[PDB]
Design a protein around this ligand. Structure first.
Ligand SMILES: *[C@@H]1O[C@H](CO)[C@@H](O[C@@H]2O[C@H](CO)[C@@H](O[C@@H]3O[C@H](CO)[C@@H](O)[C@H](O)[C@H]3NC(C)=O)[C@H](O)[C@H]2NC(C)=O)[C@H](O)[C@H]1NC(C)=O
Ligand SMILES: *[C@@H]1O[C@H](CO)[C@@H](O[C@@H]2O[C@H](CO)[C@@H](O[C@@H]3O[C@H](CO)[C@@H](O)[C@H](O)[C@H]3NC(C)=O)[C@H](O)[C@H]2NC(C)=O)[C@H](O)[C@H]1NC(C)=O
Ligand SMILES: *[C@@H]1O[C@H](CO)[C@@H](O[C@@H]2O[C@H](CO)[C@@H](O)[C@H](O)[C@H]2NC(C)=O)[C@H](O)[C@H]1NC(C)=O
Ligand SMILES: *[C@@H]1O[C@H](CO)[C@@H](O[C@@H]2O[C@H](CO)[C@@H](O)[C@H](O)[C@H]2NC(C)=O)[C@H](O)[C@H]1NC(C)=O
Ligand SMILES: *[C@@H]1O[C@H](CO)[C@@H](O[C@@H]2O[C@H](CO)[C@@H](O)[C@H](O)[C@H]2NC(C)=O)[C@H](O)[C@H]1NC(C)=O
Ligand SMILES: *[C@@H]1O[C@H](CO)[C@@H](O[C@@H]2O[C@H](CO)[C@@H](O)[C@H](O)[C@H]2NC(C)=O)[C@H](O)[C@H]1NC(C)=O
Ligand SMILES: *[C@@H]1O[C@H](CO)[C@@H](O[C@@H]2O[C@H](CO)[C@@H](O)[C@H](O)[C@H]2NC(C)=O)[C@H](O)[C@H]1NC(C)=O
Ligand SMILES: *[C@@H]1O[C@H](CO)[C@@H](O)[C@H](O)[C@H]1NC(C)=O
Ligand SMILES: *[C@@H]1O[C@H](CO)[C@@H](O)[C@H](O)[C@H]1NC(C)=O
Ligand SMILES: *[C@@H]1O[C@H](CO)[C@@H](O)[C@H](O)[C@H]1NC(C)=O
Ligand SMILES: *[C@@H]1O[C@H](CO)[C@@H](O)[C@H](O)[C@H]1NC(C)=O
Ligand SMILES: *[C@@H]1O[C@H](CO)[C@@H](O)[C@H](O)[C@H]1NC(C)=O
Ligand SMILES: *[C@@H]1O[C@H](CO)[C@@H](O)[C@H](O)[C@H]1NC(C)=O
Ligand SMILES: *[C@@H]1O[C@H](CO)[C@@H](O)[C@H](O)[C@H]1NC(C)=O
Ligand SMILES: *[C@@H]1O[C@H](CO)[C@@H](O)[C@H](O)[C@H]1NC(C)=O
Ligand SMILES: *[C@@H]1O[C@H](CO)[C@@H](O)[C@H](O)[C@H]1NC(C)=O
Ligand SMILES: *[C@@H]1O[C@H](CO)[C@@H](O)[C@H](O)[C@H]1NC(C)=O
Ligand SMILES: *[C@@H]1O[C@H](CO)[C@@H](O)[C@H](O)[C@H]1NC(C)=O
Ligand SMILES: *[C@@H]1O[C@H](CO)[C@@H](O)[C@H](O)[C@H]1NC(C)=O
Ligand SMILES: *[C@@H]1O[C@H](CO)[C@@H](O)[C@H](O)[C@H]1NC(C)=O
Ligand SMILES: *[C@@H]1O[C@H](CO)[C@@H](O)[C@H](O)[C@H]1NC(C)=O
Lengths: 993, 47
């Protein structure tokens, strides 16, 4: 915090916890200046000498050292004083030579921060060299006249006096730095209660995000903002009168006169000893009746009756809008003036001022008119809400100027009809002189939230219609991607070198001036930040997105004879996905979360009975409903036991799958790929002993009453689940004799697409080379462009962001006076504090309601993905069904599951070949036999269309080019053929002897 | 708003935006009565 752009300044000796927090104080810099080696011919600066000043008349000063270098010993540091107009402040490590009465020549001694007037000394305090290890900085601040040896306070007094000089003695060391400063707002991230860095509100593009959204280390995505700045041509449109007017406001005056007698018994017998009225235009009301006239606050009988007129009498002169107005003063009684003279009287509402009056006043009320009361003057006001007359103080400056010249299409200030805004104004009267766009009462149209959408103006050849829309920066955005700021996505064109979809784009200069314009590059998939056919990298430059797709084929559908394309060779294209399957159960302890560790707050809480039952029952229900069918999910899919490690030194044939399964040398039972998944992201003793940076938030949670519960499947019972599942996928089948742990399963699962089982010595190394290329693309794919990794990222960030906002909802006070509850009862009254405490407790229980509802919605999400998970485990892993492109964009071969952060990660293996052959095809036969008969042969279902090669005839499967002689069980005999055949004269059944 | 069952009556020269909005005022009808051509022998009513 001792950089060349700001000086830190600790806010008064306490520290709020780990996180960003805002302050306001003298933090900036202006006129940085250096100085070094202010010593004479002596080998060390002598202690106690106050000389060596430097005249600076500024509103601050700061003497800063290099980063923790200047020790307190001899030949290194001396007095380093300011001075005010009369009083001084000087530090002195006065170790003994002969001079001061301290008598110590060592460390572990004290200091002397002491003020000094013209002749004498006072305020000796002696802070130790402990807690102040090394001289870092030294300020002197104008307001409150306080002085700051590095960080906290050492001395305040009464005055408000600016700095006049400063100066430091030292023999050698770092070159010291003098700097003066102004006062801005800033906020400082600090962990453990000591400042690391600050963010200033200096109008920088990095600063405005922190200064408006009260945070740093921001998430990725979009963020809107503002920067209000306008000194341009303002224009005012006043309310036009009939014709030929100079807008002159009338002045209605009042004065207490030599009034008459107080009233007799009747409430109609009180006479208004003034009368005024409002007709049109503008007015102001000179009330000189604040002179020794108290205001009487309304209560059950006496006082004012200002309900139905929310303004108070000394606030009429601001901009209001009435429809008819008439005020008058009247000297009646006080206890029943307004409460009777509003209902049965002649005014909408009335006020009741008072003074020192004689107590001979006959009051007005039914049945109580025989006493003697006070006589304070009561004013009347007959308000009718509307828009005909407007009350204002200053005279309107448009003096004989009919509205001919007001600006259009420029970002101006406007004050039209007493409602201040900031936007620009178009001309829309071409579409509005038709469609009777306003009725016979022509003034503005309010939209919602009290602004103006369309107003009128009068004075030209014909009346027009103007529309008000806000300026160019009403919604600017700037894109962040990953960890840092990239550029402002605005609506204006400040030579913006890039156009996105319906928005203009600029880019902030990072160091060098270049790298502003380039040719866009085509990206397959990007997870960074995506915005409408355009993708933004953390480098800063955009790159347009265009999705790829892979080929597929269903090709044999055969009419009249023509050659067809069926594959001979084949490849495997991997595809991943992630499905969530678990949830952390919570347990809200409402009594310890709402109130702190106090003796009180609990007796006030014990009439909030059933709301803790309501906040507890839904959490208990979702906990039980998750915990039962989680064990159902574990008992439906855990195959047979198979408690065998299978730790990937098992000799397979030619399939390098040891990349994908677990290793012998690891402290946790973990393979390589889910270790790569884990590096992108319940037994403790919370009393003593930390573990990590993120796992040790459990002690901050348990000390506020948000604790977790272990699942019904225990820890180290799920790390055997994945290994047992792949062990049942591999070993299931063979009797473990003949080097077949993983290969034979794959070859006997790949020939189900055609129609054979477990063929040898053909299609054995082709599968090996194809699967080796597939796992090569797989080990390339995870680190840069995959599908599972960003899903892992979004799920982990949402699961963390649910609970970390209902912990930071504690310092957020509700409608109240403070946040903590220990010092509400100490500042104010007893029976007035209970409303504050009730508001705060109701707010915190509302926050727990939000937590429980979010947890139930997330439970519905995870139960959905868990039943999809048990369906995909039951089908894609152990079955190999023929459902086309259920899992992995094609007719799938095999899957292998792996562990994840609270889920499972699949690896699907598709079947998409590309290399084809060109072979002639035919659709049927009709052989005629010898004596008398006729039939046809059509290829049956599930055995594929049949082809010919160089004279002979062969059937084949629809996916693998595998010629084979036609047998007797693949025929369909039909008594028809219609010249779309071959018609061999001899039989082609090829039966046997 | 000039039917035979109500008379409109604009609430004080400003207009709230597109949508339904409530007021209270003299809007009903009782004893509708007609009248026509209140002129004499002159070709136009004198101002
Ligand atoms: C603001 O105006 C008030 C009304 O004009 C003034 O109050 C008046 O003060 C007079 C002097 O005390 C009173 O006159 C006396 O009233 C009593 C009845 O209570 C008679 O017996 C006295 O004979 C009479 N004094 C005479 C005639 O000399 C008025 O009655 C009284 N008016 C009232 C109460 O309504 C305020 O003094 C005045 N405030 C200022 C100017 O600051
Ligand atoms: C917003 O649009 C309005 C609609 O075009 C403009 O109002 C027009 O201003 C013109 C000039 O003042 C008027 O033209 C004049 O019309 C009269 C009668 O038709 C002719 O005798 C004049 O010769 C003619 N002036 C010329 C040709 O220079 C338009 O009649 C008038 N249109 C209306 C009132 O509907 C507004 O001026 C415009 N706003 C601004 C700020 O320019
Ligand atoms: C800054 O404060 C110091 C400390 O009082 C001032 O030093 C004194 O100056 C007066 C007259 O200038 C001398 O009579 C005193 O002897 C000085 N004090 C000591 C301890 O020697 C200094 O003048 C102030 N700076 C300015 C610019 O006024
Ligand atoms: C701060 O400490 C100094 C020590 O120098 C105190 O100064 C003494 O003041 C008294 C009364 O004025 C004198 O009789 C002594 O001779 C001074 N000591 C010296 C010169 O060594 C000063 O009073 C202290 N300030 C307080 C207690 O407010
Ligand atoms: C929050 O932001 C601060 C920036 O002030 C990060 O602190 C930096 O972290 C990197 C990581 O190695 C260090 O190299 C820097 O030296 C740190 N700077 C300072 C001033 O300490 C901090 O890591 C962020 N916290 C996150 C992202 O959780
Ligand atoms: C705030 O205190 C924590 C607690 O010690 C510090 O966290 C330690 O950071 C070091 C890094 O140098 C790790 O080696 C330790 O394992 C961490 N302790 C844990 C996790 O308990 C943290 O660095 C402190 N912040 C500072 C000094 O700015
Ligand atoms: C099924 O058994 C056959 C016969 O043993 C295995 O074929 C052997 O394959 C290896 C690897 O290519 C060759 O070195 C041998 O010469 C083959 N044996 C022969 C031809 O008799 C086949 O690999 C087995 N299938 C598996 C293990 O999945
Ligand atoms: C600004 O810095 C210059 C550096 O030489 C210095 O001379 C001057 O006094 C400074 N002005 C101030 C501190 O007002
Ligand atoms: C404050 O110091 C500056 C330094 O040059 C001087 O010009 C100015 O007169 C001073 N103001 C005073 C002594 O009131
Ligand atoms: C700081 O000083 C300025 C000087 O004008 C003053 O207006 C402001 O109120 C002060 N800030 C405080 C006392 O927090
Ligand atoms: C500020 O407080 C001191 C303390 O005694 C006093 O001497 C001084 O007069 C006060 N300043 C005022 C009242 O302006
Ligand atoms: C906001 O306005 C200020 C005032 O000129 C300007 O310096 C700053 O660059 C603006 N922020 C942007 C354009 O992001
Ligand atoms: C009184 O009204 C006149 C116009 O009638 C105006 O010029 C003058 O400023 C007003 N007096 C005030 C506001 O004190
Ligand atoms: C109200 O009238 C008094 C009568 O002298 C006058 O002094 C005062 O300035 C006026 N107040 C205004 C015009 O705000
Ligand atoms: C934005 O301004 C540039 C000038 O550098 C211009 O070439 C471009 O056409 C403008 N964009 C528009 C008008 O959409
Ligand atoms: C498909 O397989 C053939 C031979 O097995 C190979 O030459 C070709 O490169 C593969 N195509 C891919 C993997 O896209
Ligand atoms: C594979 O690793 C296990 C782990 O202990 C070991 O027992 C076995 O002998 C290893 N297989 C070898 C070395 O062939
Ligand atoms: C499998 O691939 C890994 C990746 O480096 C390699 O270390 C290992 O030797 C390979 N195993 C084989 C080819 O049997
Ligand atoms: C665990 O916490 C208990 C709490 O009393 C404590 O007695 C024990 O020493 C702790 N164990 C440690 C710190 O290893
Ligand atoms: C197969 O070969 C024939 C003749 O050589 C040709 O007409 C036909 O287009 C080929 N089929 C392909 C290339 O798919
Ligand atoms: C009611 O209407 C009749 C004619 O329809 C008329 O003569 C009478 O004066 C009316 N009464 C009123 C308006 O009170």
């Amino acid at each position: 915090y001792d950089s060349s752009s700001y000086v830190y300044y600790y806010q008064s000796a306490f520290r709020p916890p780990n996180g960003w927090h805002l302050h306001g104080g003298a933090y900036a810099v202006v006129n940085i200046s250096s100085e070094s080696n202010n010593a004479g011919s002596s080998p060390g600066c002598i202690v106690g000498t106050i000389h060596g000043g430097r005249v600076v008349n500024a509103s601050s000063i700061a003497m800063t050292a290099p980063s923790s270098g200047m020790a307190w010993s001899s030949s290194q540091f001396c007095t380093a004083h300011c001075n005010f107009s009369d009083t001084t402040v000087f530090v002195t490590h006065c170790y003994k030579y002969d001079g001061c009465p301290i008598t110590g020549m060592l460390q572990k001694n004290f200091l002397r921060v002491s003020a000094m007037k013209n002749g004498q000394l006072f305020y000796n305090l002696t802070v130790s060299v402990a807690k102040y290890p090394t001289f870092k900085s030294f300020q002197c601040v104008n307001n409150l006249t306080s002085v700051y040896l590095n960080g906290d306070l050492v001395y305040t007094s009464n005055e408000t006096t600016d700095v006049t000089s400063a100066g430091v003695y030292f023999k050698a060391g770092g070159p010291i730095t003098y700097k003066v400063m102004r006062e801005v707002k800033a906020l400082a991230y600090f962990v453990n209660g000591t400042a690391q860095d600050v963010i200033l509100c200096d109008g920088s593009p990095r600063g405005l995000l922190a200064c408006q959204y009260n945070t740093g280390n921001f998430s990725d995505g979009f963020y809107p903002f503002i920067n209000s700045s306008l000194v341009k041509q303002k224009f005012i449109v006043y309310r036009e009168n009939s014709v030929n007017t100079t807008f002159t406001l009338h002045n209605f005056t009042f004065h207490n006169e030599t009034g008459a007698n107080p009233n007799p018994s009747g409430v109609q017998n009180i006479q208004t000893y003034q009368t005024q009225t409002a007709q049109s235009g503008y007015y102001n009301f000179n009330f000189s009746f604040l002179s020794s006239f108290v205001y009487k606050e309304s209560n059950f009988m006496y006082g004012s009756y200002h309900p139905s007129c929310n303004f108070r009498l000394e606030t009429i002169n601001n901009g209001l809008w009435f429809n008819s107005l008439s005020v008058s003063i009247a000297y009646g009684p006080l206890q029943g003036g307004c409460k009777q003279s509003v209902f049965s009287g002649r005014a909408t509402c009335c006020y009741a001022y008072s003074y020192g009056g004689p107590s001979l006043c006959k009051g007005v009320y039914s049945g109580e008119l025989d006493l003697n009361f006070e006589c304070g003057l009561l004013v009347y006001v007959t308000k009718s809400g509307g828009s005909r007359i407007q009350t204002a103080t200053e005279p309107p400056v448009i003096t004989r100027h009919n509205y001919n010249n007001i600006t259009l299409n420029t970002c101006v200030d406007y004050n039209i009809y007493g409602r201040t805004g900031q936007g620009f104004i178009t001309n829309v009267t071409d579409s509005a002189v038709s469609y009777n766009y306003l009725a016979d009462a022509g003034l503005a149209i309010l939209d919602t939230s009290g602004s103006i959408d369309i107003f009128v103006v009068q004075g030209e050849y014909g009346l027009t219609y103007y529309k008000v829309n806000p300026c160019e920066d009403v919604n600017q955005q700037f894109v962040v991607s990953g960890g840092k700021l990239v550029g402002i996505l605005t609506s204006r064109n400040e030579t913006g070198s890039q156009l996105l979809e319906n928005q203009f784009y600029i880019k902030i200069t990072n160091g060098t001036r270049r790298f502003r314009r380039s040719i866009t590059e085509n990206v397959a998939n990007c997870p960074y930040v995506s915005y409408g056919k355009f993708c933004i990298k953390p480098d800063g430059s955009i790159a347009t997105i265009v999705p790829k797709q892979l080929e597929q084929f269903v090709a044999p559908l055969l009419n009249v004879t023509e050659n067809v394309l069926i594959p001979n060779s084949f490849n495997l294209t991997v595809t991943d996905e992630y499905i969530q399957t678990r949830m952390d159960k919570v347990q809200i302890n409402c009594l310890q979360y709402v109130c702190g560790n106090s003796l009180d707050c609990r007796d006030l809480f014990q009439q909030y009975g059933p709301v803790c039952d309501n906040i507890l029952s839904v959490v208990n229900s979702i906990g039980q409903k998750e915990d039962m069918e989680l064990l159902n999910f574990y008992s439906s899919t855990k195959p047979a036991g198979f408690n065998t490690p299978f730790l990937s030194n098992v000799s397979t044939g030619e399939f390098n799958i040891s990349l994908l399964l677990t290793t012998p040398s690891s402290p946790r039972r973990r393979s390589f790929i889910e270790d790569l998944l884990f590096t992108s992201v319940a037994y403790k003793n919370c009393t003593a002993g930390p573990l990590g940076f993120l796992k040790d938030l459990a002690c901050a949670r348990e000390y506020n009453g948000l604790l977790v519960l272990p699942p019904i499947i225990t820890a180290e019972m799920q790390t055997l689940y994945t290994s047992s599942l792949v062990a049942s996928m591999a070993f299931g089948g063979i009797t473990a004799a003949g080097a077949i742990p993983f290969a034979t399963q794959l070859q006997a699962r790949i020939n189900h697409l055609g129609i054979t089982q477990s063929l040898l010595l053909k299609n054995q190394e082709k599968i090996a080379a194809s699967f080796n290329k597939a796992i090569g693309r797989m080990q390339e794919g995870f680190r840069s462009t995959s599908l599972a990794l960003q899903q892992i990222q979004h799920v982990v960030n949402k699961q963390n962001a649910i609970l970390t906002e209902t912990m930071a909802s504690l310092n957020k006070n509700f409608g109240a006076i403070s946040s903590l509850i220990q010092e509400i009862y100490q500042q104010l009254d007893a029976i007035q504090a209970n409303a504050q405490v009730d508001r705060l407790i109701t707010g915190r229980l509302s926050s727990l309601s939000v937590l429980a509802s979010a947890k139930q919605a997330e439970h519905i999400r995870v139960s959905q993905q868990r039943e999809l998970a048990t369906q995909k485990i039951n089908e894609c892993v152990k079955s190999q069904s023929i459902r086309y492109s259920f899992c992995g964009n094609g007719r799938h071969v095999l899957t292998i599951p792996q562990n994840a952060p609270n889920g499972i990660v699949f690896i699907h293996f598709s079947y998409t070949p590309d290399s084809f052959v060109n072979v002639t095809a035919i659709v049927g036969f009709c052989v005629k036999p010898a004596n008398a008969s006729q039939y046809a042969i059509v290829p049956a279902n599930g055995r594929g269309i049949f082809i010919q090669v160089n004279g002979s005839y062969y059937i084949t499967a629809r996916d693998m080019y595998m010629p084979r002689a036609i047998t007797a069980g693949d025929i369909v005999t039909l008594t028809s053929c219609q010249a779309n055949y071959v018609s061999v004269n001899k039989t082609v059944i090829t039966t046997f002897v």
